[PDB]
């Protein structure tokens, strides 16, 4: 009866930061609420200044990560204000049902609804919008994300034993696919509607213009880049809702892998590279041993270099020769 | 001594049924046998009426569904009728030589051949046709299917308890690849012949212009969708001859996966998504538990939605509010 | 203490074939000490007579595997001779820090440098050059290979048994993205500054226009075809760094595949096809029990036979009619 749970409200936070919550589950099962407002706006996606007319879960591509524990209820409220243009919706790869909910939250905009669906099964799912004749479109303009269901004990290794992360980050990985005019420059619009037609027709080519995480070329550099110390347990999700992507840390590795992000599973070990098929999110687990810069990329190395799928960790702490040194640095013969 | 072995002619049946048989086998080793027909045939493949001249096992893309148990022998009758004018053969994934049957079983039209080998690995497999210098010409034309070589105890979970299905289905997967003109209109032929030139420069752009299951677009949907209730356990076999794909159940979940359709593995649990590589088939296992409609998708949702790649369930029952339910119905703010 | 550890230097052999080692550590650690001489070349890819200027470790595309044990020392020595005109450096996806050595290695032409590094997880690893800003050109000219490290006691089954191979070969496969005019015919340059501006626009399709394995169309058939005998137990090491591949053995199956190629994990039974993500090593084992000619092909069937990615092997020994046999060999209805 779920008339006598206990509810909370949990309040997001935008990628690549997660909002707050226990590995362990310190309650029983609860009712979780959220609330998201679907936001339609232009977003710059390159240093040359390609503008798209993005569609947003919150505002962010990708939309946040929600997190809740196996068996808890996900009550959302899903909010899509008259300042939007077109019909919404949402469907959650983690639910069972009317199309992952996607049929019973189908708001034009000035209109809101509340879904409810039980968590019923482990493992990190993408989330993302799905409105019928209109699914691509939707979803290669940025709208979609996703939520980790924990198990109530947490997570653990290949041995059934406890694995602990202190940082979590997401990464959402978008393929995005610009209209070009006939010499390759691209296109701008001043509406989403006006560029429905030429949308299609980018999008059957099969081939992404631009390849980015969080939302833009270059987001998760400078500044901007993921951070952690030496010897912190760090656990990266990464979602990609339509496209395979092969997700690799320049200089490290993935120590315990779920490349199709299930839990109850057990994890891969020692993982170079690994493939998360488009539609599905991933996790991987990695304990930082040197410090310095690292490159976390799609090991298509055209589609990390060249298209965007590229971001950074700034490491901190002491140098390991024993792992690594130089023995001769680069000098004439 | 296979002279002294039961034998037992099997009869099969169209896409996406499948032929009658024993998941737990009841006998001892048998010769099971089987007879295909070739037949190379004008097909319709979209709703603006798109032609191509298919090569196919039975008068089907995929061709059919073959089911035998480890360490059957299977016996196939080829036959190449004098109507055709091109040369064919077949290579079984299953198979342990001779490129898997394609160097004996090369029939001109005209001619026909018996093939035996045996069954040694449990799992599904791709088969299709593979004649020297021609290959992916005809397996892109649609000459392939797939083979179930069942353990003789039946599936097994990943804890080595039975699973038992209600109800099987086969899905095949084509990428097509129909030659256009300068302004992207597709092209008609009269024969095979006069098709080949242009199709292996349509083949060398590794863009497919239509990627459907069981023939065409929209060929599993409407009358033609797949059915099950709740509480029913289904097996989804999927094949793929060419291309990777990643299959999904919209509003449902794989409960157990062999993503490479391997029964000596364990399966992967409660998978969102599934990567089945280009020439591999897979298995997934789902029991129903909400009453609806389901869509069946390869989850590169422009191959899905723009190129046809998409399916149906109508699945009958009670709906179950604790799984899902809608609290608040589309409405005004 | 690095000082007192034994050394031994290894000499560095010509893929396909794989320098002499032991499977089984007969020694503690040691270190291991190889030398690369960096070499740009005019290479021929195809049977046309297309010309590129690949970019090689040790003279081949792939460069060639290393083979040491789980915690051994690699010490690399890297030479970029003065006849070369680009800066490359060296990552190995094995070694954990510094982007895999990258940041460490950064070699002009004139000069040489010695990396050591802790060979700290056992698998089959990528190595690439990957100079800031020209990552996709360097490892798409085919600067790239494979670095095996064993675990002590050598491969073992599911089941935790050992596996002993009695040859092991090293297939590296190789995407080439070489410019075009507009006509479609392929471009000669006189050095690789040359061809670097159309080299990036080339790359930006995501379209190779061939896929070779050791470096050129048909370059592991005919004489060059990998041999062994029925009974022999194979591993098939295989390599993509940039791109994902689907490997497969015409008339064969990896009884023992790690398809991310770490082998802490259990390796997967039974293949008949298996996706190594772009950016990774596999590794599959075969007992050959049929005589003949099988393919090696990436199985999506447009790669293998109409862009390169196909190689053969020779197989000695008696044919058994038990697994297949020709009951009625092809005649006349
Ligand atoms: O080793 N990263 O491309
Ligand atoms: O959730 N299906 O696209
Ligand atoms: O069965 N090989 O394409
Ligand atoms: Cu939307
Ligand atoms: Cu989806
Ligand atoms: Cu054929
Ligand atoms: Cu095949
Ligand atoms: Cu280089
Ligand atoms: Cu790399």
């Known amino acids: 009866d779920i008339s006598t749970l206990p509810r909370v409200k949990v309040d997001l936070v935008k ?11 310190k309650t029983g099962p609860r009712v979780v609420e959220f609330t998201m407002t679907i936001e339609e706006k232009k977003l710059v996606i390159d240093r040359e200044g390609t503008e798209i007319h993005a569609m947003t879960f919150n505002g962010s591509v990708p939309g946040p990560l929600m997190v809740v524990h196996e068996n808890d209820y996900v009550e959302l409220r899903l909010i899509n204000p008259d300042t939007n243009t077109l019909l ?70 290949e041995k059934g034993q406890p694995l602990t992360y202190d940082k ?61 110390a030496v010897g912190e347990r760090v656990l990266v999700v990464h979602s990609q809702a339509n496209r395979d992507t092969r997700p690799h840390l320049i200089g490290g590795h993935g120590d315990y892998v779920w490349a199709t992000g299930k839990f109850r599973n057990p994890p891969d070990l020692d993982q170079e590279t690994w493939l998360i098929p488009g539609g599905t999110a991933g996790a991987a687990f990695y304990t930082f041993r040197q410090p310095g810069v690292y490159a976390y990329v799609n090991h298509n190395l055209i589609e990390a270099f060249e ?6 960790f700034k490491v901190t702490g002491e140098w390991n020769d024993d792992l690594m040194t130089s023995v001769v640095k680069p000098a004439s013969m």
Request: charged content about 20%; overall charge negative.
């Open 88 to 157: 919404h919706n949402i469907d959650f790869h983690a639910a069972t049902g009317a199309l992952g909910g996607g049929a019973l939250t189908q708001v034009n905009p000035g209109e809101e609804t509340t879904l409810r669906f039980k968590a019923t099964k482990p493992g990190v799912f993408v989330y993302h919008c799905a409105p019928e004749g209109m699914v691509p479109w939707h979803v290669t303009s940025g709208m979609n994300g996703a939520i980790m269901v924990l198990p109530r004990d947490g997570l653990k290794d």
């Open 15 to 25: 990628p690549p930061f997660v909002h707050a919550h226990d590995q362990v589950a």
């Open 307 to 312: 298209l965007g799928a590229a971001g950074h």
């Open 168 to 228: 979590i980050y997401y990464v959402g990985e978008q393929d995005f696919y610009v209209p070009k005019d006939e010499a390759g420059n691209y296109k701008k619009y001043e509406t989403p509607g006006e560029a429905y037609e030429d949308a299609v027709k980018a999008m059957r080519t099969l081939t992404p213009t631009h390849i980015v995480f969080n939302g833009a070329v270059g987001a998760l550099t400078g500044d901007h880049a993921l951070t952690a």
